Design an enzyme around this catalytic site. Structure first.
Site, PDB file in Angstrom:
ATOM      1  N   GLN A  58      39.287  40.736  50.879  1.00 28.83           N
ATOM      2  CA  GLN A  58      40.171  40.455  49.744  1.00 28.83           C
ATOM      3  C   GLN A  58      40.127  41.598  48.732  1.00 28.83           C
ATOM      4  O   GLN A  58      41.132  41.935  48.100  1.00 28.83           O
ATOM      5  CB  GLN A  58      39.770  39.132  49.064  1.00 28.83           C
ATOM      6  CG  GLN A  58      40.793  38.593  48.041  1.00 28.83           C
ATOM      7  CD  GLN A  58      40.326  37.303  47.349  1.00 28.83           C
ATOM      8  OE1 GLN A  58      41.137  36.476  46.968  1.00 28.83           O
ATOM      9  NE2 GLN A  58      39.023  37.142  47.183  1.00 28.83           N
ATOM     10  N   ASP A  65      42.110  44.427  50.232  1.00 25.74           N
ATOM     11  CA  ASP A  65      43.494  44.016  50.126  1.00 25.74           C
ATOM     12  C   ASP A  65      44.018  44.160  48.697  1.00 25.74           C
ATOM     13  O   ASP A  65      45.150  44.593  48.486  1.00 25.74           O
ATOM     14  CB  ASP A  65      43.589  42.592  50.608  1.00 25.74           C
ATOM     15  CG  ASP A  65      44.958  42.083  50.362  1.00 25.74           C
ATOM     16  OD1 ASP A  65      45.364  41.976  49.180  1.00 25.74           O
ATOM     17  OD2 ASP A  65      45.668  41.782  51.338  1.00 25.74           O
ATOM     18  N   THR A 119      48.567  50.988  43.625  1.00 25.35           N
ATOM     19  CA  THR A 119      48.656  52.176  44.463  1.00 25.35           C
ATOM     20  C   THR A 119      48.284  51.873  45.917  1.00 25.35           C
ATOM     21  O   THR A 119      47.393  51.061  46.180  1.00 25.35           O
ATOM     22  CB  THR A 119      47.736  53.242  43.918  1.00 25.35           C
ATOM     23  OG1 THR A 119      46.385  52.785  44.008  1.00 25.35           O
ATOM     24  CG2 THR A 119      48.091  53.531  42.449  1.00 25.35           C
ATOM     25  N   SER A 134      41.872  51.124  42.642  1.00 30.07           N
ATOM     26  CA  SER A 134      42.819  50.753  41.576  1.00 30.07           C
ATOM     27  C   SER A 134      42.522  49.344  41.062  1.00 30.07           C
ATOM     28  O   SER A 134      43.005  48.959  39.988  1.00 30.07           O
ATOM     29  CB  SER A 134      44.278  50.861  42.052  1.00 30.07           C
ATOM     30  OG  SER A 134      44.401  50.498  43.418  1.00 30.07           O
ATOM     31  N   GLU A 164      40.775  34.876  40.496  1.00 33.78           N
ATOM     32  CA  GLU A 164      41.285  33.867  41.406  1.00 33.78           C
ATOM     33  C   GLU A 164      40.215  33.064  42.081  1.00 33.78           C
ATOM     34  O   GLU A 164      40.399  31.943  42.346  1.00 33.78           O
ATOM     35  CB  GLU A 164      42.240  34.435  42.452  1.00 33.78           C
ATOM     36  CG  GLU A 164      42.875  33.412  43.384  1.00 33.78           C
ATOM     37  CD  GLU A 164      42.152  33.235  44.661  1.00 33.78           C
ATOM     38  OE1 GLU A 164      41.319  34.063  44.943  1.00 33.78           O
ATOM     39  OE2 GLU A 164      42.367  32.263  45.371  1.00 33.78           O
ATOM     40  N   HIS A 182      42.740  34.630  55.081  1.00 31.02           N
ATOM     41  CA  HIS A 182      42.828  33.245  54.646  1.00 31.02           C
ATOM     42  C   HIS A 182      42.149  32.308  55.637  1.00 31.02           C
ATOM     43  O   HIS A 182      41.710  31.227  55.266  1.00 31.02           O
ATOM     44  CB  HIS A 182      44.303  32.834  54.481  1.00 31.02           C
ATOM     45  CG  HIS A 182      45.027  33.596  53.411  1.00 31.02           C
ATOM     46  ND1 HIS A 182      46.367  33.407  53.141  1.00 31.02           N
ATOM     47  CD2 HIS A 182      44.590  34.523  52.520  1.00 31.02           C
ATOM     48  CE1 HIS A 182      46.731  34.205  52.150  1.00 31.02           C
ATOM     49  NE2 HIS A 182      45.674  34.899  51.761  1.00 31.02           N
TER      50      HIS A 182
HETATM   51  C1  HEM Z   1      41.938  31.831  46.687  1.00 30.19           C
HETATM   52  C2  HEM Z   1      42.186  32.997  47.694  1.00 30.19           C
HETATM   53  C3  HEM Z   1      41.248  33.529  48.444  1.00 30.19           C
HETATM   54  C4  HEM Z   1      39.719  33.177  48.470  1.00 30.19           C
HETATM   55  C5  HEM Z   1      39.239  31.992  48.182  1.00 30.19           C
HETATM   56  C6  HEM Z   1      41.904  34.586  49.241  1.00 30.19           C
HETATM   57  C7  HEM Z   1      41.311  35.394  50.127  1.00 30.19           C
HETATM   58  C8  HEM Z   1      41.917  36.441  50.717  1.00 30.19           C
HETATM   59  C9  HEM Z   1      41.265  37.279  51.659  1.00 30.19           C
HETATM   60  C10 HEM Z   1      39.838  36.967  52.249  1.00 30.19           C
HETATM   61  C11 HEM Z   1      42.165  38.139  52.087  1.00 30.19           C
HETATM   62  C12 HEM Z   1      42.032  39.255  53.205  1.00 30.19           C
HETATM   63  C13 HEM Z   1      40.886  39.677  53.846  1.00 30.19           C
HETATM   64  C14 HEM Z   1      43.385  37.875  51.378  1.00 30.19           C
HETATM   65  C15 HEM Z   1      44.524  38.606  51.473  1.00 30.19           C
HETATM   66  C16 HEM Z   1      45.704  38.507  50.771  1.00 30.19           C
HETATM   67  N1  HEM Z   1      46.091  37.489  49.976  1.00 30.19           N
HETATM   68 FE1  HEM Z   1      44.650  35.999  49.574  1.00 30.19          FE
HETATM   69  N2  HEM Z   1      43.248  34.583  48.998  1.00 30.19           N
HETATM   70  C17 HEM Z   1      43.467  33.612  48.041  1.00 30.19           C
HETATM   71  C18 HEM Z   1      44.693  33.382  47.504  1.00 30.19           C
HETATM   72  C19 HEM Z   1      45.826  34.132  47.612  1.00 30.19           C
HETATM   73  C20 HEM Z   1      47.085  33.801  46.939  1.00 30.19           C
HETATM   74  C21 HEM Z   1      47.334  32.698  45.867  1.00 30.19           C
HETATM   75  C22 HEM Z   1      47.994  34.750  47.301  1.00 30.19           C
HETATM   76  C23 HEM Z   1      49.474  34.886  46.802  1.00 30.19           C
HETATM   77  C24 HEM Z   1      50.323  34.081  47.734  1.00 30.19           C
HETATM   78  C25 HEM Z   1      51.807  34.315  47.488  1.00 30.19           C
HETATM   79  O1  HEM Z   1      52.510  34.755  48.441  1.00 30.19           O
HETATM   80  O2  HEM Z   1      52.295  33.997  46.354  1.00 30.19           O
HETATM   81  C26 HEM Z   1      47.322  35.688  48.205  1.00 30.19           C
HETATM   82  C27 HEM Z   1      47.990  36.736  48.793  1.00 30.19           C
HETATM   83  C28 HEM Z   1      47.328  37.678  49.557  1.00 30.19           C
HETATM   84  C29 HEM Z   1      47.882  38.886  50.102  1.00 30.19           C
HETATM   85  C30 HEM Z   1      49.244  39.580  49.772  1.00 30.19           C
HETATM   86  C31 HEM Z   1      48.951  40.209  48.334  1.00 30.19           C
HETATM   87  C32 HEM Z   1      50.266  40.981  48.018  1.00 30.19           C
HETATM   88  O3  HEM Z   1      50.410  42.067  48.626  1.00 30.19           O
HETATM   89  O4  HEM Z   1      51.144  40.399  47.276  1.00 30.19           O
HETATM   90  C33 HEM Z   1      46.763  39.458  50.870  1.00 30.19           C
HETATM   91  C34 HEM Z   1      46.706  40.774  51.646  1.00 30.19           C
HETATM   92  N3  HEM Z   1      46.019  35.234  48.460  1.00 30.19           N
HETATM   93  N4  HEM Z   1      43.239  36.814  50.549  1.00 30.19           N
HETATM   94 CA   LIG Z   2      45.041  51.272  45.428  1.00 34.11          CA
END
Ligand code: HEM
Ligand SMILES: [Ca+2]
Ligand SMILES: *[C@@H]1O[C@H](CO)[C@@H](O[C@@H]2O[C@H](CO)[C@@H](O[C@@H]3O[C@H](CO)[C@@H](O)[C@H](O)[C@@H]3O)[C@H](O)[C@H]2NC(C)=O)[C@H](O)[C@H]1NC(C)=O
Ligand SMILES: *[C@@H]1O[C@H](CO)[C@@H](O[C@@H]2O[C@H](CO)[C@@H](O[C@H]3O[C@H](CO)[C@@H](O)[C@H](O)[C@@H]3O)[C@H](O)[C@H]2NC(C)=O)[C@H](O)[C@H]1NC(C)=O
Ligand SMILES: *[C@@H]1O[C@H](CO)[C@@H](O[C@@H]2O[C@H](CO)[C@@H](O[C@H]3O[C@H](CO)[C@@H](O)[C@H](O)[C@@H]3O)[C@H](O)[C@H]2NC(C)=O)[C@H](O)[C@H]1NC(C)=O
Ligand SMILES: *[C@@H]1O[C@H](CO)[C@@H](O[C@H]2O[C@H](CO)[C@@H](O)[C@H](O)[C@H]2NC(C)=O)[C@H](O)[C@H]1NC(C)=O
EC number: 1.11.1.7
Length: 595
Positions: free
Chosen positions: A105, A108, A184, A190, A258, A351
């Site tokens: 996360q 990401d 970025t 960042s 979060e 997730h």
């Molecule tokens: C609560 C949330 C987490 C932990 C308890 C959690 C965890 C992760 C991990 C472990 C990820 C990758 C290894 C990961 C990736 C990305 N997330 Fe997620 N995540 C939690 C909650 C959220 C929520 C809320 C969102 C937004 C959902 C939406 O579409 O509105 C979320 C997104 C993302 C995402 C895309 C981020 C972006 O580029 O906009 C990951 C790459 N996660 N999460």
């Molecule tokens: Ca970056």
């Protein structure tokens, strides 16, 4: 008549072109093409966008518009019938610590963020969206399917607002819709320093020429620092416990609080900065604040890149690592930095690695206090459990000693995230991350599962039997077909995650390819990649090749028992050694001297 490019948000920057350090916005990394990889620009498109009207509408937006002849099942329906499960027994990963999920996360968040539409400056369209489930413009509610338990208790839908797109935030139409990447694309910390100017400068402690990152002045962790508190009308963190009154934290990245283990890792990295900046003043009493800041910041980014590429990727990816991310052969300016739109969904494999609980452990790595283990869902935007209940030291131990959840085709996403997600403006612990992922998959115009199997040179199943063979699961293939009616229509997030994991990895072949290509790009296309000759000196890369997450903990906590390899499952006390045994980061190569 095709276009060269689009011109609304961008007051342009000049580029120093002599400059040593990365900009905060990512701009100027690529000399011939400045904006490539910079924050607040369109997510790159690896394949053309696929909407219902070819421009911006949601497959599934209009009742009557099919995708390849079939209706496109409700996101919450796919979620219920496929994604969920009751029994948390046996779902743990026997060879991945909880840190495995957490770094994921973190990385990401360093790479991509596609907010929801900035058009939310004193309007009820959010409350109207929320209240009567009226789809329209950027309100695209997640409708509940019949027989959905949430109908008995929550209403008819779940909020959802389309992602920010480029060339306004209000009216547009004339070419395909492109969502914004607000951070970025480079692996550059960042998330710690920020991606805009307000923000960076203001995380910084400028009253003292030492280039420290500003810290909390209203709370201490046994003498150790906490990130500063935030500033909003509605802080989420306060909201979840109005008695405690503890604000969310202020980090370079927006999502910092979060969940409590993400805030924890953020707290962790912010200490590494000040620790580096302090050892840098001791070594260099003449260097001013900006020089201390920028060289600490330099080093921190390098640490993130190394833990990610050396320790993290090799075990997400497994046997496919060496097919996509070869030995680094140097900065190549022909590569595209840009995080693609599909990657922001591919990286959501994480997730399925989040387990249902989080623990606090004490010095002997046994339960801390009487409420040691907590339901994941009580820790969304929870900062009070850190400030007024032990600090980060018990949580970090759990990150080391506890395990990640394992993706499992019959138990995909824990209900703590699938039914109990808290989102920052709404009142309940009642959302569904899996349904949101799917709705967002379409909000972004993602091509289907087979378009991507093709992109990756993999077979494209056309029938139940074919899909059975690819998924290696008869019953999962069945539910998918029943829901989507052609492999062609399967949303990339769920099709990508339905595939069995590769040898010695945690994603299947499709995701190995999508993720593998992106990480290869952000590495090769980085002018400041740590291992690119010039960036660091002879003896500088040697001291850096010794960093580890175990040492990061040792230097920024009062923990003294850590695994040597933090990402595999580690059992105390056998898999744990004393901090004195682990290599430190030798700052001696940063020494410049003068007369
Ligand atoms: C609560 C949330 C987490 C932990 C308890 C959690 C965890 C992760 C991990 C472990 C990820 C990758 C290894 C990961 C990736 C990305 N997330 Fe997620 N995540 C939690 C909650 C959220 C929520 C809320 C969102 C937004 C959902 C939406 O579409 O509105 C979320 C997104 C993302 C995402 C895309 C981020 C972006 O580029 O906009 C990951 C790459 N996660 N999460
Ligand atoms: Ca970056
Ligand atoms: C920006 O940096 C300055 C300088 O490092 C920070 O001030 C310094 O903060 C430390 C720890 O917070 C203070 O140390 C101790 O303070 C306690 C109680 O206030 C006292 O018992 C001791 O006498 C000890 O000095 C210290 O006062 C202070 N040092 C100096 C030279 O001012 C400041 O907090 C930073 N600002 C932000 C927003 O982070
Ligand atoms: C639990 O997972 C461990 C990590 O996935 C795994 O250990 C790993 O074994 C592989 C196979 O040889 C090695 O692969 C790496 O080899 C060197 C790194 O030393 C690199 O140059 C290669 O590119 C490749 O990444 C590793 O040596 C090793 N991983 C680590 C971090 O040391 C265990 O086998 C798993 N444990 C069980 C019980 O299954
Ligand atoms: C909202 O945050 C509250 C803290 O501001 C929290 O109440 C506090 O809960 C702790 C347990 O974590 C109680 O402390 C326990 O241990 C202490 C040891 O000194 C004992 O004094 C107590 O009897 C108790 O066993 C505190 O008593 C309590 N503090 C206050 C000021 O009430 C709430 O539980 C949180 N509520 C929610 C919904 O999260
Ligand atoms: C730098 O990166 C590019 C990627 O854009 C690499 O490109 C190539 O590999 C082939 C050599 O076997 C070339 O024939 C192709 O034109 C090219 N492929 C792609 C997808 O670009 C290459 O490593 C570097 N490019 C140059 C010009 O040196």
């Amino acid at each position: 008549s095709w276009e060269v490019g689009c011109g609304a948000p961008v007051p342009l920057v000049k580029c120093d072109e002599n400059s040593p350090y990365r900009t905060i916005t990512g701009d100027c990394n690529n000399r011939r093409s400045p904006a490539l990889g910079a924050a607040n620009r369109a997510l790159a498109r690896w394949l053309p966008a696929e909407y219902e009207d070819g421009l911006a509408l949601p497959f599934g937006w209009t009742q009557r518009k099919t995708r390849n002849g079939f209706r496109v099942p409700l996101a919450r329906e796919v979620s219920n019938k496929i994604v969920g499960y009751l029994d948390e027994e046996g779902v743990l990963d026997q060879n991945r610590s909880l840190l495995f999920m957490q770094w994921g996360q973190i990385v990401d968040h360093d790479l991509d963020f596609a907010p929801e539409t900035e058009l939310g400056s004193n309007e009820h369209s959010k409350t109207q969206c929320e209240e009567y489930c009226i789809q329209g413009d950027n309100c695209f509610p997640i409708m509940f399917p019949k027989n959905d338990p949430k109908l008995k208790t929550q209403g008819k839908c779940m909020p959802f607002f389309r992602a920010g797109f480029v060339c306004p935030t209000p009216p547009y139409q004339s070419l395909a819709r492109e969502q914004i990447n607000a951070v970025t694309s480079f692996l550059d910390a960042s998330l710690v320093y920020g991606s805009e100017p307000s923000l960076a400068s203001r995380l910084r402690n400028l009253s003292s020429p030492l280039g420290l990152m500003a810290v909390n002045q209203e709370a201490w962790d046994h003498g150790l620092a906490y990130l500063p508190f935030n500033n909003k009308k509605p802080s989420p963190c306060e909201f979840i416990n109005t008695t405690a009154r503890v604000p969310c934290f202020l980090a370079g990245d927006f999502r910092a609080s979060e969940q409590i283990l993400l805030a924890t890792a953020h707290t962790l990295l912010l200490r590494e900065h000040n620790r580096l900046a302090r050892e840098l003043k001791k070594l260099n009493p003449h260097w001013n604040g900006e020089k201390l800041y920028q060289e600490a910041r330099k080093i921190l980014g390098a640490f993130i890149q190394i833990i990610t590429f050396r320790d993290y990727l090799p075990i997400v990816l497994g046997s496919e690592m060496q097919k996509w991310i070869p030995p680094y052969q140097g900065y190549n300016n022909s590569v595209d930095p840009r995080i693609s739109n599909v990657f922001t969904f591919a990286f959501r494999f994480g997730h399925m690695e989040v387990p249902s609980t989080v623990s606090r452990l004490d010095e002997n790595y046994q339960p801390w206090g009487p409420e040691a283990e907590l339901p994941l869902h009580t820790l969304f935007f929870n900062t009070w459990r850190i400030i007024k209940d032990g600090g980060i030291d018990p949580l970090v131990r759990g990150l080391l000693a506890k395990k990640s959840k394992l993706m499992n085709q019959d138990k995909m996403v824990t209900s703590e995230l699938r039914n109990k997600l808290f989102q920052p403006t709404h009142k309940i612990h009642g959302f569904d991350l899996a349904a949101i992922n799917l709705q967002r998959c379409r909000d972004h115009g993602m091509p289907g599962y087979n378009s991507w199997r093709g992109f990756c040179g993999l077979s494209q199943p056309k029938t139940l039997k074919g899909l059975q063979t690819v998924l290696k699961n008869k019953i999962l293939a069945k539910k998918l077909m029943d829901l989507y009616k052609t492999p062609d229509n399967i949303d990339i997030w769920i099709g990508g995650n339905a595939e069995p994991m590769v040898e010695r990895g945690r994603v299947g072949p499709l995701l190995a390819c999508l993720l593998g290509r992106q990480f290869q790009q952000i590495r090769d296309g980085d002018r400041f990649w740590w291992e690119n000759p010039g960036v660091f000196t002879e003896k500088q890369r040697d001291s850096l090749q010794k960093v580890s997450f175990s040492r990061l903990i040792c230097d920024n906590t009062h923990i003294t028992k850590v695994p040597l390899h933090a990402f595999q499952a580690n059992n105390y006390p056998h898999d744990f050694v004393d901090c004195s045994t682990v290599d430190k980061l030798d700052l001696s190569p940063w020494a410049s001297r003068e007369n």
